[PDB]
Design a protein around this ligand. Structure first.
Ligand SMILES: [K+]
Ligand SMILES: [K+]
Ligand SMILES: [K+]
Ligand SMILES: [K+]
Ligand SMILES: [K+]
Ligand SMILES: [K+]
Ligand SMILES: [K+]
Ligand SMILES: [K+]
Ligand SMILES: [K+]
Ligand SMILES: [Mg+2]
Ligand SMILES: [Mg+2]
Ligand SMILES: [Mg+2]
Ligand SMILES: [Mg+2]
Ligand SMILES: [Mg+2]
Ligand SMILES: [Mg+2]
Ligand SMILES: [Mg+2]
Ligand SMILES: [Mg+2]
Ligand SMILES: [Mg+2]
Ligand SMILES: [Mg+2]
Ligand SMILES: [Mg+2]
Ligand SMILES: [Mg+2]
Ligand SMILES: [Mg+2]
Ligand SMILES: [Mg+2]
Ligand SMILES: [Mg+2]
Ligand SMILES: [Mg+2]
Ligand SMILES: [Mg+2]
Ligand SMILES: [Mg+2]
Ligand SMILES: [Mg+2]
Lengths: 206, 151, 82, 127, 99, 101
RNA sequence: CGCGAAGAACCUUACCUGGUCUUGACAUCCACGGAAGUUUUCAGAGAUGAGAAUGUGCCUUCGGGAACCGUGAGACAGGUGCUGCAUGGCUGUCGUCAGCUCGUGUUGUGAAAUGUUGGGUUAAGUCCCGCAACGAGCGCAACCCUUAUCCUUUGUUGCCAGCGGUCCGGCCGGGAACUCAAAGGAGACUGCCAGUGAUAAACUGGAGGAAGGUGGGGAUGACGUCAAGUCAUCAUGGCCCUUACGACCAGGGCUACACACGUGCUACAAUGGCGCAUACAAAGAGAAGCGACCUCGCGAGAGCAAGCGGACCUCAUAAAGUGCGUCGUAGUCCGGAUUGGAGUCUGCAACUCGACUCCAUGAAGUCGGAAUCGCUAGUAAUCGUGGAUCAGAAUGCCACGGUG
């Protein structure tokens, strides 16, 4: 069968939104496009900076972007010149004046985006997918995660028939709405096609 | 109905008379949720049954109802691709239900003008044991006696 | 129908009939304007109306006034099934 | 003093004020025969007041909003029964047996996606 | 006069901490305040097809709730005006105030 | 959805804002019921076709902003129903949670 | 098979006929010449080809740099072209069916088995006993939303019980009771009482209660199956096209019509048709928008123009129903297909090919062969209302209440 998106089913119960602005119907679609262009830019520029989450908030005619990252000295740059030439180009895109804040991810191996792109980077480095999956599962469980499962899909090891292989440890109750599930997705573009990665990380209830 | 064997829903009595069997009769007459239309048809038919052909109104209604109620009907029973017709006694809840259903369907396929006068003729035919609602009763009784050997 | 405050005709067709009005009978006028209405000013001309692939000549008679030019050029060819 | 009740049926809501003594029932500043043309709606608003006997003993001032004919008449009957149990409180246990104390919670079921109605499915064909 | 203040937001926790901020800024500055009242919440529904190609009967249904709060103010002092124009509100509350 | 189809769309709305909502005067003012009902109305009906075959908001297909999909559009978000759903589950549209009533 | 398509006159549009372009309709980099915009000029079906007017932002750290236009040469752009049997993502389906497994131990040469079977029980691999198994995971249940009862808080744009007044309309003074609005809290657990049961788990019944045994409905879809669906949402490996399989324009087409099938709508009437009078809803939408009052039109509509970003204004006088009159069982005062004439509105434009109005026309159809579908209660049946898409254009889809 097909599953529900575990972040989408938990909005307003245990997981918050990544955008926290208000609009009427006139200004709604243009705030949504400019949020798309700001997120598209920061993903491409900070690709080697391990960015997990981009929270956009808009007060009255402002914008402030909070970049959750595991590696904050490289998004900051040498005492703060890299975030200016981030906010001299974000306010370019949004039109409104901009502010950039940066939040440190303490344990980057309990973050489902950072685990998914770590597996994705190894699959493009020509690493066997079992090692990439099993090291990611062991590293998160040894840090106190209550459960994890990873899953890769599509032409594994250059095989000509695609497969979906997954590996679970711990406890991942996807039907429980109190469950703090961190889920994300990444794609790896290799010489034989696209390999999709999915990571679920459980951290406790309520 | 495999597992959850149920009770039953309780219904209102008739407003003009205090009858729950007339409330069942208006329900069987009712088409597409039109209860107000169906009470006017029964009350029109019950008046012209009472005033033209002998009074004691709902006393006359059950005199017509007694004469169409069956006492034994037939039911299939599948064994091996040859399925017998076994006579079974009719429950008295089902007795009133079959009698009122046969009268409404008899009164539907007439040629008179109103529905109330088709109903009035069928109740006056049934009070004197004629018509076609009575003949549905003995056709069931003929078939029940025909398969009497399979008791 | 279109409402009573102005029949429709294109301008390139309106000018082209105007110069066939004074300068006389010509070759049939090639047009693509099937949506134009037939005026009094066009009786006697032959308008070749486009129908998708060809230009069908239409000799304008007095009963064609107030109709469209596209009505005298069938766009679908069909003759029997089997 | 006025003794009060609130009753509701499907989408109707009725407030009921009872006053000590006579047989006047007035509903939305009209009386019963002017408001409810249907005899069935007249009887179910009468119904709580014949188990308790009130010849002409209680004036009833009632207003109602929403729903239709049978919805308003059931919302009145539930509002009367709550006003009479405020009125003396010995009436409850025979009013329980008559089923008038129960709020009828039967609401209209919502239309569902893929279905023509709440439960009506489109016509199936094997091929 | 009276000054009337309308608050709308997508969240109800965030909107009534915002009303609690402006009911207590306004008699800390010493004005009678009227309300706050909750106006009816307008919910807008959407219904999409989830499959990229066919399968018409497989759908999702979504909703946006817009909560509304109304505060009227009885005693608009000079101190009241400069208090609640310069307040620290969140990014989700929209304010539109009436003279 | 075919780069040229979007460029046809981008050019259509930019050329629609070029003329109309500014010079809709040619039909909203002169083709009126009073003394302009003489030849000046008729020249206005002729003048309306000098403007390009675009210019009119009735040729906006109103596609999705990311993929350019012409069907399944939602005017509230500007995105197609595939991209509305894909970004709502990611938590990107504010206040958009799954409805259950 | 009313499926993608939540809405093909042009556009959309991917197809056809014809007219046209070749570093390009869309992007980056180089060189040179022009600041962008303005607004008219004649040809042409249009794309495309020919004059006037003009800007000069900006620091020049004075060579010019930054926006926008044209031309030139290349890397390149572009492809709704092929392969869903190379893929990602997403979706259908068995099926909301109660299942599907693992660790360690034990048994078997082994594939494997046990656990997960057995006695009961449950909606449930649900729970309790027994037992070479002891534990665990994904499912089940619960946590979430809504509906049914009460309490607290707040009281307008919502409300009117007690009051004063009134033009008799909550409309004014006023009231904070009630309806309602939306935040918080309470309530239902087989909790209580009998009986049955293996001193069990659980069943039948009763009390109380708004609600009783999963209270109603929704969301939620395990491991997997069908090389199931989608390269035409997007993304993507390989292949193919590169003065064309790319790009622009006009007109046509997707609406053809001997036929067959699927899903619907309206009927074949008297439980009805028509005429007049008169009750009772919910849920929604609205600024290139919803548009009242009044005047004109038989009408669709038009003119004028208030209010409303909205519990305030508008869409918007619900229909079935009820009362009276008429028709009197007919191919009809049933049915409203088809066609003729005259119009309205939207739009550059209603010929192909829009919706609606008026007058006239008044086919088939009298309950449907073999066969077949849906539904267990506020359900079926029937009656209206709203929304998305949308300039205009629902008998479809998604929602809402009435009767029942
Ligand atoms: K696939
Ligand atoms: K084992
Ligand atoms: K491909
Ligand atoms: K066409
Ligand atoms: K249909
Ligand atoms: K059919
Ligand atoms: K047309
Ligand atoms: K007729
Ligand atoms: K429309
Ligand atoms: Mg209904
Ligand atoms: Mg369907
Ligand atoms: Mg359009
Ligand atoms: Mg089918
Ligand atoms: Mg076309
Ligand atoms: Mg098993
Ligand atoms: Mg076993
Ligand atoms: Mg279990
Ligand atoms: Mg066991
Ligand atoms: Mg569950
Ligand atoms: Mg209070
Ligand atoms: Mg296949
Ligand atoms: Mg074209
Ligand atoms: Mg078609
Ligand atoms: Mg109106
Ligand atoms: Mg007949
Ligand atoms: Mg069932
Ligand atoms: Mg009907
Ligand atoms: Mg509808």
């Amino acid at each position: 069968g097909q599953k529900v998106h575990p972040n989408g089913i938990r909005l307003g119960i245990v997981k918050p939104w990544n955008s926290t602005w208000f609009a009427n119907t006139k200004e709604f679609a243009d705030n949504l496009d400019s949020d798309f262009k700001v997120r598209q830019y920061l993903t491409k520029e900070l690709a080697k900076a391990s960015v997990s989450r981009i929270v956009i908030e808009r007060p009255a005619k402002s914008i402030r972007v909070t970049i959750h990252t595991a590696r904050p000295g490289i998004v900051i740059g040498k005492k703060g010149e890299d975030v200016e030439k981030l906010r001299k180009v974000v306010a370019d895109i949004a039109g409104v004046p901009a502010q950039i804040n940066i939040a440190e991810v303490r344990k980057p191996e309990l973050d489902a985006k950072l685990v998914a792109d770590s597996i994705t980077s190894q699959l493009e480095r020509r690493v066997m997918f079992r090692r990439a999956m099993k090291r990611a599962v062991q590293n998160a469980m040894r840090l106190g995660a209550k459960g994890i499962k990873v899953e890769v899909s599509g032409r594994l090891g250059g095989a000509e028939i695609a497969r979906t292989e997954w590996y679970r440890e711990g406890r991942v109750p996807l039907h429980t709405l109190r469950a703090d599930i961190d889920y994300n997705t990444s794609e790896a573009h290799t010489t034989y096609g696209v390999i999709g990665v999915k990571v679920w990380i459980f951290k406790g209830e309520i | 109905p495999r597992r959850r064997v149920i009770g039953q829903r309780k219904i209102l009595p008739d407003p003009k008379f205090g009858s729950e069997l007339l409330a069942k009769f208006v329900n069987i007459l009712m088409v597409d949720g039109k209860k107000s239309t169906a009470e006017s048809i029964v009350y029109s038919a019950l008046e012209t049954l009472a005033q033209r052909s002998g009074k004691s109104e709902l006393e006359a209604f059950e005199v017509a109802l007694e004469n169409v109620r069956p006492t034994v009907e037939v039911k299939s029973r599948r064994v091996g691709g040859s399925t017998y017709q076994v006579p079974v006694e009719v429950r008295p809840v089902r007795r009133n239900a079959l009698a009122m259903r046969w009268i409404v369907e008899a009164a539907r396929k007439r040629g008179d003008k109103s529905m109330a006068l088709r109903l009035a003729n069928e109740l006056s035919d049934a009070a004197e044991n004629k018509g076609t609602a009575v003949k549905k009763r003995e056709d069931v009784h003929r078939m029940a006696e025909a398969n009497k050997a399979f008791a | 129908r279109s409402l009573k405050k102005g029949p429709f005709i294109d301008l390139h067709l309106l000018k082209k009939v105007e110069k066939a009005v004074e300068s006389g009978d010509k070759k049939p006028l090639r047009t693509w304007s099937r949506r134009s209405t037939i005026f009094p000013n066009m009786i006697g001309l032959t308008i070749a109306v486009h129908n998708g692939r060809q230009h069908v000549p239409v000799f304008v008679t007095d009963e064609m006034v107030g109709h469209k030019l596209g009505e005298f050029a069938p766009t679908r060819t069909y003759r029997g099934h089997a | 003093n006025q003794y009060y009740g609130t009753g509701r049926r499907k989408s109707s809501a009725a407030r009921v004020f009872i006053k000590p003594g006579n047989g006047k029932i007035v509903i939305n500043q009209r009386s019963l025969e002017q408001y409810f043309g249907r005899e069935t709606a007249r009887m179910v608003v009468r119904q709580p007041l014949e188990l308790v006997d009130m010849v002409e003993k209680l004036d009833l001032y009632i207003t109602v909003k929403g729903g239709g004919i049978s919805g308003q008449a059931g919302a009145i009957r539930h509002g009367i029964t709550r006003a009479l149990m405020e009125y003396d409180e010995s009436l409850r246990s025979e009013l329980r047996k008559a089923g008038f104390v129960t709020r009828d919670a039967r609401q209209v079921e919502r239309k569902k996606v893929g279905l023509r109605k709440a439960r009506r499915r489109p016509q199936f064909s094997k091929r | 006069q009276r000054i009337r203040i309308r608050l709308k937001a997508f969240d109800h926790r965030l909107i009534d901490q915002a009303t609690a901020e402006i009911v207590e800024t306004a008699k800390r500055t010493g004005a009678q305040v009227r309300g706050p009242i909750p106006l009816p919440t307008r919910k807008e529904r959407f219904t999409v097809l989830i499959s990229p190609h066919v399968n018409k009967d497989a759908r999702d249904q979504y909703e946006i709730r817009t909560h509304l709060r109304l505060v009227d103010i009885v005693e608009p002092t000079e101190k009241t005006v400069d208090a609640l124009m310069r307040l620290d509100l969140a990014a989700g509350v929209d304010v539109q105030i009436s003279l | 959805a075919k780069q040229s189809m979007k460029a046809r769309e981008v050019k259509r709305v930019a050329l629609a804002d070029k003329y109309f909502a500014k010079r809709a005067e040619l039909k909203a003012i002169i083709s009126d019921v009073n003394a302009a009902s003489d030849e000046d109305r008729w020249n206005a009906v002729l003048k309306l076709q000098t403007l390009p075959r675009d210019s009119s908001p009735s040729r906006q297909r109103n596609r999705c902003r990311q993929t350019g999909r012409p069907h399944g559009f939602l005017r509230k978000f500007g995105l197609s129903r595939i991209k509305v759903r894909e970004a709502a589950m990611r938590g990107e549209i504010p206040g958009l949670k799954k409805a259950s009533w």
